[PDB]
Amino acid sequence: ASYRDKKVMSIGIVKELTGLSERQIRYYEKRSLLFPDRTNTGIRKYSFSDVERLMDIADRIEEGVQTSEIRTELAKKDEARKMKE
Amino acid sequence: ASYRDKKVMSIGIVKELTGLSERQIRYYEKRSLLFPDRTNTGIRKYSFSDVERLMDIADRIEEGVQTSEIRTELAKKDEARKMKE
DNA sequence: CGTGTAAGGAATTCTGACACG
DNA sequence: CGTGTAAGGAATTCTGACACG
């Protein structure tokens, strides 16, 4: 849970965990699909929940959904999550 | 659980999480107190369980226990863990 | 014993560009 | 649209040494 949301992995490990390239991972963030934190030196840090978020994103893109559509879906899920709490 | 044991953090994040220097973290490993994995390029990777292991180590060292004594205690705990499973 | 620092080398990540389309 | 690559710069980690004790 806390382990799941703590931003502690750099992009290289995420790449290995998701099978996504750095290009893809940074692009999804650029498309406001996820929000990694940044060390004070500019290095992006991801949590396990981010990794899972990235895999769901990749799956949707596989089924032919544009990032914009994915952003809408993600927004609903995020809102929904705030409800179950 | 799986999140807890997956080796995914590099030493910089561990330092920030434990408050230990790189010197201390690498030394404890050298004293066979923990076993981080290594990327194929030589970079040590730690899991959340490692981070907690490191904090317990630091606490024992605080109470004046030598690394050798800590290694014995850790060995028992590891053996005990294999029992509760 | 345990931990601090200086020192160069290797590896990682960063951004913006060029490319295809 | 989404993703690949080349390109230099900044930041990270690595090991072994010197230091105190």
Swiss-Prot record, chains A, B:
GO terms for molecular function: DNA binding; DNA-binding transcription factor activity. Disulfide bonds: none annotated. It comes from the Bacteria. The keyword DNA-binding applies. Under conditions of nitrogen excess, the DNA-binding activity is inhibited by the formation of a stable complex with feedback-inhibited GlnA. Residues 11-30 bind DNA. The amino acid sequences of the N-terminal DNA binding domains of TnrA and GlnR are highly similar, and both proteins bind to DNA sequences with a common consensus sequence. In contrast, the C-terminal signal transduction domains of TnrA and GlnR have no homology. Homodimer. Under conditions of nitrogen excess, TnrA forms a stable complex with feedback-inhibited GlnA. This is HTH-type transcriptional regulator TnrA. It comes from Priestia megaterium (strain WSH-002).
